[PDB]
Write a protein that binds this ligand. Structure first.
Ligand SMILES: Nc1nc2c(ncn2[C@@H]2O[C@H](COP(=O)(O)OP(=O)(O)OP(=O)(O)O)[C@@H](O)[C@H]2O)c(=O)[nH]1
Ligand SMILES: Nc1nc2c(ncn2[C@@H]2O[C@H](COP(=O)(O)OP(=O)(O)OP(=O)(O)O)[C@@H](O)[C@H]2O)c(=O)[nH]1
Ligand SMILES: Nc1nc2c(ncn2[C@@H]2O[C@H](COP(=O)(O)OP(=O)(O)O)[C@@H](O)[C@H]2O)c(=O)[nH]1
Ligand SMILES: [Mg+2]
Ligand SMILES: [Mg+2]
Lengths: 160, 430, 430, 430
């Protein structure tokens, strides 16, 4: 199977979007499942800043500071709080325009293309290796031989 | 076959709605359970057998007041699912109740409004109550008015807003949302009545002789004013007045519809019966500047039109003989382009007394609704208060972060400047 | 609804909570066995704010207790009302920090905090509608001032829209019990300004001064200081658990008391406070409460409030009283002291009334005022910090655990910038 | 001379049958012993002198529930040898209850059905109850329906199946047997009603205000719905409806007979009487998407036909005046080829209350059975769940080893694809 150039990119961007949507620290008690499903399909400001930080964009210049990103987010986000997949793409394009704002000779399209090369989105393995959490364990109240044991089973192989 | 629907939003709105709904139930003989042990039809509806249901809806995002209502003696009266309640309060933030949490609640309120309107056949108009200096009150009132103005169109809506006092204030940020809400209801409400608390405090202190009043005493006077205004729709009278017969008599121009009210007599049973309470003296007391229900001086401006309601055993000739005396006085002057400015209504039913209340039982009363040029002072002082903090952009971050744009504050300022210029332009003689 | 969870860290925070929860339980009539034995119906209506429900009808606080050493929590369990706390919420390490901020924030506090964050997430995800969190900790200790502040950032990163409270005890130079207090105070203030929505400073010196001068008791102990802090803590959220004339949640105070997002350091005070021998002489009236409320010696901080000008003020009256008297007294306390109130924001005092007084008292007041006089505390803290840092004294303890002097320089610069920009508005004029 | 036979198979079926059989006995005045201390004939039969015997049969392979029934208070009611019980459970395996152990039990059930049918003279049809996500329930329901469809032919059968919730699930393998049972009853049942547990949990939480519900609370609501559906056969009414008058009014095409139900009002005695419960407000509440008895959104699809039953003192003109209001609303839109879509029934007997239950006593109620295009979402999500595990052939060995062929899974998938295509083809306008 295959995907379009903007979409392969679109497929990889959707994979990043779905990963960061799940990282949201939802505050509140006794949610509806509809709200949980909604929050899994949108990115909040914290997860968008986490994305920009992990991709080494946040605070790199005066146009991508925490405050500038917050203003941009409130301006382009759904309900001023949330990004869907389409608004997430628009926000990345706006961040690309801001991040390369001092490069006067670049078109806005070339600024977006330069950002997509900077994040290495065309290489799914390198792009995915930059994805980082926030936090979870699987609920287990936690605390010489710790070093790992790769039990290489003996091939009861074609020769053996 | 004549009906009216009252909307109560915010803590102040609900607390004055409670005050008016004891009075209406008492005046029509309906027990607090809703059961009687053809005039009720204006405010109530018959269920077929037994109880009556008010044509009112209560709105609030903060659940405490509604929960207090749903456990008091009036738990059986209101329909269980017209007391719409939220979970999170707007916390005096106007942008919250207009952009963030009010939008998810407004749809249920509009559905309830439709379900109540389909029952009425002769709908006269809507009434709305909201304290302006709060987040949810002002924001939800603005949003509801904006939705109703397009859903129904030409139906008349009346707003009994409570503006902040000149110097006495409970919050610190109420000028911002007061100005924004005035912006919103300037182009969306047909009538707005001034109700600031300081004037009514002075009225209670001087006449009722209460030195420690609470909000209930204020709300009872407001309820009496509402009852006097709407008496003509549900009682026989020699000179009737309808709600739709206002913009033709009190509103010279579409922009100018803010007016201030007064009531008379206000007196306690301990010294009420020692004096005769003639119609002349009560109509003189009603025009006294110290008895205005809003803290504004009518001596500082012209009058435009006066609509004033009587009820009891008053005779029209005595009313005319008193209007002549007021026209005679040199301290009250009307605008040049208005030769006659009085609209008079006479009703037969005397005002009803609430047990354990402040007011005594009397046979004559007068309620005036007067439109005057002097109202511009409250706008000027609110504007001055707004400018002081908007110069340094204080408290703005609490509004920009709730979805509102930066420029939204300026255009409300421009509309207030336009209103103040219009009030000056109208008051000059030809 | 709109409930909050309790999180405390360190020995000082644990001792504060051990009295705060006793006060709350006594207010709601909960026995130390978790069984309700109250008298009034209102005692149970809003118990979901602080208490959870379990099988068998008993109630359990939603508190989370954390420390780097097990002694303090092993001691608080044997005290009165110590059985209410769920044993699962107790999380502790085996090493401790030794009043070293680096150990409690980089090396030891980082590995342990996952377990406490797990239970914090469990508590917050479950609750009906979150209002926010309140934090009690001390800035004079290592493990507290490190782990608590890092937990503040971790919580803020996951719940950016909720509200966050912090009751912080800062080390005064008068009563000093630790030599390394300036270092971990300065390091903590750097992180605290960036994430806390509200901060309330409390000083042991001011508590001793109050106990010696107003109550006039011979031998103060930590139990009395904890009791005063607990009463002040309970007074803030009283109207959120009880009905009143003007309900005002924490978010409403946040809107009205913080003009700019970085100015959120308040100092508080509680009234009335009288000696045992003079409790019969005094008569509880609103003037008597308001005169003691604005008294300089009544503040819970050594900062002198007549050395600066109030940006804004708040008062949370308790008991049944007339609102007119409250408003007129608030106006009078602002007309007679115009020199100590900033002039470019008019009507900068917020008031609220709750009809349920504290058990044993008929009237009570909690005061929360944002004033420019708080600069003096940061000035002296930074003075001691720069006196000790210039010689690099005790620096090796911090630098041996991955920290460097650059983070000290940035913290000092940011703290000085905060000090400067907080007083910038003191000299501002309209 | 009108009769109906109800079939209960599986644990969920028996537990909802118990729930409906307390309600019927209470509604007809029959004591739990079966003795009265001409409307009973629909559900019961007279023995000549004294007791009444229900026209019901209980089926299960696992003996625990039947043994619980045969020792409770209702031990004397049911005939001893119509509580058919097995020895070995199917253990959530569909192939077991359709091919291995159900075949040896089905003959006794069919003999009992014949012995009950020969007694009836005016048999209207059959009712069947079965939780779909179980082995014995789905398998035996499929086998019984397949046998009855050929033994009797054109007699009407109604199925009150309980599909699994969108995300909440008790088993891990229930999509497989749910899909297979849907395959089986698609071509064999005349009416199927949706009953997933999550929607009813939300209904209880929001309206009944129960935070810890159990299965009994759900089953009581289902029993009330059944009683409302079958009231018209045993009570006098102004506008009667029979069971056979459904496929002519709710089923546009033979394939499409899955519809979802709703009920109103649902309210507790603590706040029921404070509001008037007019017919307009209850018929508005019944159409609210949040009050659907199955977790599906009607706003996502068109309506095809609505059959809705009233009972109590409702007057037809008030019903028409409320159908008009619903036709007015813009958020509810019907399919193009259906100008009128409402079938209305009115009955006089008010709903009966069960002592110790949740619902209060009211004089008006409404039950709607609505066929809508939005139901395809549950099929799509069940199909998606099925495909995930069928891609790797997981859990298939538990089915192939019980006599079922490999290809039997694919054709159920093809029939679901056909049904989803049919639902899309019907909903497009001409
Ligand atoms: N006349 C009168 N005014 C009231 C009353 N209660 C509150 N107010 C006024 O309302 C203003 C603040 O708005 P509130 O009604 O209290 O609160 P709100 O409208 O619900 O807005 P929120 O704060 O978001 O809940 C105050 O300045 C008061 O002057 C009342 O009972 N009577
Ligand atoms: N509404 C409702 N659903 C139930 C009840 N009991 C079980 N269920 C549902 O039934 C499904 C499983 O089928 P069961 O009825 O429990 O068991 P079964 O039908 O007898 O099939 P076996 O497991 O072979 O015994 C579960 O997913 C439940 O959702 C009940 O009391 N009420
Ligand atoms: N109010 C109050 N303050 C206390 C109490 N115990 C200690 N403190 C203060 O806490 C400071 C020491 O904090 P510390 O115990 O080292 O905090 P930790 O490092 O987190 O354990 C001292 O300056 C005391 O003034 C108490 O019981 N009540
Ligand atoms: Mg409020
Ligand atoms: Mg079973």
């Amino acid at each position: 199977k295959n995907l379009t150039k903007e979409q392969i990119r679109m497929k990889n961007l959707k994979e990043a979007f779905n990963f960061y949507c799940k990282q949201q620290n939802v505050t509140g008690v006794a949610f509806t499942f509809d709200r949980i499903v909604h929050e899994q399909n949108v990115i909040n400001l914290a997860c968008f800043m986490l994305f920009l930080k992990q991709f080494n964009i946040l605070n790199k210049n005066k146009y991508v500071t925490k405050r500038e990103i917050q203003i941009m987010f409130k301006k382009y986000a759904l309900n001023y709080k949330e990004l869907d997949l389409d608004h997430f793409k628009i926000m990345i394009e706006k961040v690309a325009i801001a991040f390369y704002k001092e490069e006067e000779n670049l078109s806005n399209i070339d600024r977006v293309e330069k950002l997509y090369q900077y994040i290495e989105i065309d290489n799914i393995h390198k792009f995915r290796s930059k994805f980082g959490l926030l936090n979870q364990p699987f609920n287990i109240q936690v605390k010489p031989f710790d070093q790992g044991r790769d039990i290489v089973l003996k091939k009861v192989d074609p020769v053996v | 076959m004549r009906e009216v629907i009252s909307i109560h939003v915010g803590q102040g709105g609900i607390q004055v709605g409670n005050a008016c709904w004891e009075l209406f139930c008492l005046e029509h003989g309906i027990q607090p359970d809703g059961q009687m042990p053809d005039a009720f039809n204006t405010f109530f509806s018959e269920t077929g057998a037994g109880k009556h249901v008010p044509r009112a809806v209560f709105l609030d995002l903060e659940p405490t007041v509604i929960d207090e209502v749903r456990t008091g003696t009036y738990r059986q009266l209101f329909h269980p699912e017209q007391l719409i309640s939220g979970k999170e309060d707007a916390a005096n933030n106007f942008a919250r109740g207009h952009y963030t949490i009010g939008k998810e609640i407004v749809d249920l309120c509009l559905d309830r409004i439709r379900k109540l309107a389909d029952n009425c056949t002769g709908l006269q108009g809507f009434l709305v109550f909201n304290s302006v200096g709060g987040g949810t009150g002002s924001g939800l009132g603005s949003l509801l008015l904006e939705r109703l103005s397009v859903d129904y169109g030409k139906k008349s809506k009346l707003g009994f807003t409570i503006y902040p006092s000149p110097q006495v204030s409970t919050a610190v940020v109420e000028p911002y949302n007061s100005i924004l809400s005035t912006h919103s209801l300037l182009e969306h409400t047909d009538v707005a009545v001034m109700l600031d608390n300081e004037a009514i405090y002075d009225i209670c202190r001087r006449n009722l002789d209460i030195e420690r009043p609470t909000y209930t005493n204020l709300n009872r006077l407001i309820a009496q004013v509402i009852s006097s205004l709407t008496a003509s729709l549900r009682f026989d009278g020699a000179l009737n007045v309808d709600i739709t017969e206002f913009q033709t008599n009190l509103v010279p121009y579409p922009r100018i519809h803010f007016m201030l009210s007064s009531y008379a007599p206000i007196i306690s049973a301990e010294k009420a019966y020692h004096e005769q309470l003639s119609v002349a003296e009560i109509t003189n007391s009603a025009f006294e500047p110290a008895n205005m229900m809003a803290k504004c001086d009518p001596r500082h401006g012209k009058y435009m039109a006066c609509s004033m309601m009587y009820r009891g055993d008053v005779v029209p000739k005595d009313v005319n003989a008193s209007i002549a005396t007021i026209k005679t006085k040199r301290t009250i002057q009307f605008v040049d382009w208005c030769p006659t400015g009085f609209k008079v209504g006479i009703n037969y039913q005397p005002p009803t007394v609430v047990p354990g209340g402040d007011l005594a039982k009397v046979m004559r009363a007068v309620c005036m609704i007067s439109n005057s040029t002097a109202i511009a002072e409250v706008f000027s002082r609110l504007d001055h208060k707004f400018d002081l903090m908007y110069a340094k952009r204080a408290f703005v971050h609490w509004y920009v972060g709730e979805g509102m744009e930066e420029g939204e504050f300026s255009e409300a300022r421009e509309d207030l400047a336009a209103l103040e210029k219009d009030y000056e332009e109208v008051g000059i003689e030809t | 609804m709109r409930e909050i969870v309790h999180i405390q860290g360190g020995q000082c925070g644990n001792q504060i909570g051990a009295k705060f929860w006793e006060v709350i339980s006594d207010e709601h009539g909960i026995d130390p066995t978790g069984t309700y034995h109250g008298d009034s119906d209102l005692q149970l209506e809003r118990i979901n704010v602080y208490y959870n429900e379990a099988t068998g009808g008993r109630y359990v606080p939603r508190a989370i207790l954390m420390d780097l050493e097990p002694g303090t929590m092993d001691s608080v369990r044997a005290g009165p009302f110590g059985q209410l706390f769920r044993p699962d919420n107790f999380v502790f390490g085996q090493t401790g920090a030794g009043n070293n901020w680096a150990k409690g924030h980089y090396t030891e506090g980082a590995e342990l905090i996952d377990s406490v964050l797990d239970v914090v997430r469990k508590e917050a995800e479950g609750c009906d509608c979150l209002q926010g969190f309140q934090i009690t900790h001390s800035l004079g200790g290592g493990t507290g001032s490190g782990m608590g502040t890092l937990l503040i950032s971790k919580v803020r990163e996951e719940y950016p829209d909720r509200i966050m409270e912090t009751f912080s005890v800062v080390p005064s130079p008068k009563v000093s019990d630790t030599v390394v207090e300036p270092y971990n105070a300065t390091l903590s203030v750097h992180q605290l300004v960036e994430n806390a929505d509200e901060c309330m400073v409390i000083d042991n010196e001011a508590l001793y001064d109050i106990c010696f001068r107003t109550l006039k008791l011979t031998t103060p102990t930590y139990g009395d200081l904890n009791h005063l802090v607990s009463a002040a803590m309970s007074g803030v959220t009283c109207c959120l658990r009880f009905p009143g004339q003007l309900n005002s949640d924490l978010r409403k105070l946040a809107v009205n008391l913080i003009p700019f997002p970085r100015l959120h350091f308040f100092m508080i005070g509680f009234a009335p406070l009288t000696s045992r021998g003079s409790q019969q002489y005094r008569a509880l009236t609103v003037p008597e409460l308001t005169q003691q409320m604005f008294d300089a010696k009544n503040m819970m901080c050594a900062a002198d409030p007549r050395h600066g000008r109030y940006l804004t003020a708040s008062a949370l009256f308790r008991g049944r009283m007339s609102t007119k008297e409250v408003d007129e007294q608030m106006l009078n306390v602002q007309n007679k002291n115009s020199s100590y109130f900033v002039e470019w924001i008019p009507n900068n005092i917020k008031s609220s009334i709750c009809d349920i007084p504290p058990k044993g008292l008929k009237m009570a007041v909690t005061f929360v005022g944002n004033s420019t006089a708080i600069q003096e505390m940061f000035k002296r803290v930074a003075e001691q910090f720069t006196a000790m840092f210039r010689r690099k004294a005790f620096l090796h303890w911090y630098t041996g655990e991955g920290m460097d002097e650059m983070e000290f320089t940035e913290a000092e610069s940011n703290m000085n910038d905060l000090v400067s920009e907080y007083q910038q508005y003191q000299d501002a004029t309209a």
